[PDB]
Amino acid sequence: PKPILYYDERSPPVRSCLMLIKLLDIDVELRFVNLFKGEQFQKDFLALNPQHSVPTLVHGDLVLTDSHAILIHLAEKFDEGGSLWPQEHAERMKVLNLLLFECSFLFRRDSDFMSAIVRQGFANVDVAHHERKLTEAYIIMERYLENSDFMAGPQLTLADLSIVTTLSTVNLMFPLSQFPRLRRWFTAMQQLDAYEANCSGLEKLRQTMESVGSFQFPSSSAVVT
Amino acid sequence: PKPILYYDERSPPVRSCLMLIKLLDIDVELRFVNLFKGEQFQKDFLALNPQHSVPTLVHGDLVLTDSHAILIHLAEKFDEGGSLWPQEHAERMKVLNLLLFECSFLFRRDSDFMSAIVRQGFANVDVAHHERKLTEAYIIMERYLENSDFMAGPQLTLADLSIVTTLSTVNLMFPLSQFPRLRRWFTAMQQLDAYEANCSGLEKLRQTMESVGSFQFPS
Ligand SMILES: N[C@@H](CCC(=O)N[C@@H](CS)C(=O)NCC(=O)O)C(=O)O
Ligand SMILES: N[C@@H](CCC(=O)N[C@@H](CS)C(=O)NCC(=O)O)C(=O)O
């Protein structure tokens, strides 16, 4: 049976799975769950994923409720032996380490900021506080890239797919002027054909946030190529 | 060389790694990083881990900066063919999915609550708000346990090691009386020889939080 992806493309971790699906030409059925309309609290979706989060994948009997498990599962099933989720143990641990950085640090901080805008309205958010927390994530990713061309080594891996979507979301608000390696890496990701899967949801998230939060992102911040 | 574990046993993800190390008899060199003195910001540790977090594992040239990668790495290198990190793909993805639940949901929410204490003082924290967020996590784990004795199936896995330490930390503040499956699972986890690895750090966290929070946990 073909994988079923419950999704809202405004979500960065959803867009990471959409990028992998495009990169590998995976046939997947998409089922939209509108997060800003609260459809993730619908009783049948809650029964499927009590964390009420997207992406959720159903593939046969398997139900995955975290983008990072979804990326790993799809790579193992549709890129066997590939370099996205590498075969050598130490290389694979490095990718796993960076996936968890995305989950535990970069996404956590971007979610904290964006959730505050939705709950409080932009004018009531302590933007300076979130600028510090997210610039700290920029600094860390800049350090990762001072060693390798890609986040987890010399070539594109699942870590880049996970990180680039949330990075593009942070960068709607906060500029990358001071981060040359991060800008070089982001520019290169934007040249990838798979990056087309990030574009639509990023823009829909931009429009939704500006509406619900009653503000405008500074147009000069976002890196476009 | 033997793995090096940078740790502060007050950290629940540290304690998860300590439990696995004891369960598998792994010979490791422990290096204490006092989080309450800010030693995670010392220049050499920051150079090692820019996220300034424990646990951090150095194993040869490999540097891991997240407990969930460390658990998987140590299981793969020291417990090949074990049940903690199952070899069958569907079972392994199930364990991975629960490891990420611990990272993304349970630990996130407990960390939000504990950080609010250290920042604001216990007397100023919106306790009811965090009670709702953390009770929601209890409700989810209770459902995870409906058809299995452990978090990811009929056997103990890495998911149980990761979740039990944070669970015990949430349980400093919020009791398990209303969750029969979760309470029975936690009691069973406490019978493990390896659970002794959780005991010392949990009580150190209690004592440290209560002094800095100028409060006492209801437990
Ligand atoms: N760590 C999880 C994070 C998933 C997550 O929190 N998704 C957000 C959207 S970016 C969501 O579904 N929010 C809906 C809700 O929490 O109710 C993953 O990587 O999939
Ligand atoms: N997702 C990470 C979380 C690690 C983490 O946040 N550890 C806390 C202690 S519980 C820490 O080191 N805090 C110090 C700091 O953030 O400066 C993991 O599982 O290892």
Side-chain angles (χ1 to χ4, degrees), chain A residues 120-141:
Chain A
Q120 312 185 238
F122 184 81
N124 301 285
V125 169
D126 187 349
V127 182
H129 164 87
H130 292 288
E131 185 175 33
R132 285 185 291 272
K133 293 313 185 174
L134 288 158
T135 54
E136 157 155 38
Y138 281 177
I139 288 169
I140 293 165
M141 288 180 293

Side-chain angles (χ1 to χ4, degrees), chain A residues 104, chain B residues 11-13 35 40-41 52-55 65-68 103 107:
Chain A
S104 176
Chain B
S11 165
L35 296 178
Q40 73 272 29
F41 298 104
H52 47 88
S53 63
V54 290
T65 55
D66 188 281
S67 66
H68 308 86
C103 182
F107 179 85

Side-chain angles (χ1 to χ4, degrees), chain A residues 93-225:
Chain A
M93 293 300 99
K94 275 194 41 72
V95 174
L96 177 57
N97 197 63
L98 268 297
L99 293 172
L100 289 154
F101 161 73
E102 195 281 335
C103 179
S104 176
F105 200 101
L106 173 68
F107 177 83
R108 182 185 180 180
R109 292 175 176 215
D110 191 47
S111 170
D112 286 340
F113 170 55
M114 299 283 271
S115 300
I117 294 173
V118 177
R119 296 191 339 261
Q120 312 185 238
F122 184 81
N124 301 285
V125 169
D126 187 349
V127 182
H129 164 87
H130 292 288
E131 185 175 33
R132 285 185 291 272
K133 293 313 185 174
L134 288 158
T135 54
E136 157 155 38
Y138 281 177
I139 288 169
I140 293 165
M141 288 180 293
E142 185 78 4
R143 296 224 202 301
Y144 291 150
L145 293 167
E146 280 180 359
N147 320 124
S148 40
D149 249 356
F150 292 82
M151 285 293 166
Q155 56 224 138
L156 176 82
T157 65
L158 296 188
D160 303 284
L161 304 178
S162 182
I163 288 165
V164 76
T165 57
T166 307
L167 182 275
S168 75
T169 306
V170 179
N171 175 236
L172 289 177
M173 183 72 213
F174 297 114
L176 284 165
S177 310
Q178 296 306 300
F179 298 96
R181 303 292 186 114
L182 205 34
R183 266 185 284 110
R184 174 179 170 271
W185 168 87
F186 190 17
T187 292
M189 296 295 298
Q190 289 191 13
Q191 309 311 124
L192 302 177
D193 174 79
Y195 190 82
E196 291 165 21
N198 188 60
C199 285
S200 162
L202 177 66
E203 167 69 5
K204 290 182 72 175
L205 178 62
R206 187 195 64 83
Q207 297 174 305
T208 296
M209 290 296 303
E210 288 193 349
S211 181
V212 180
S214 296
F215 78 114
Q216 300 179 48
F217 294 101
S219 289
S220 63
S221 180
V223 172
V224 294
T225 53

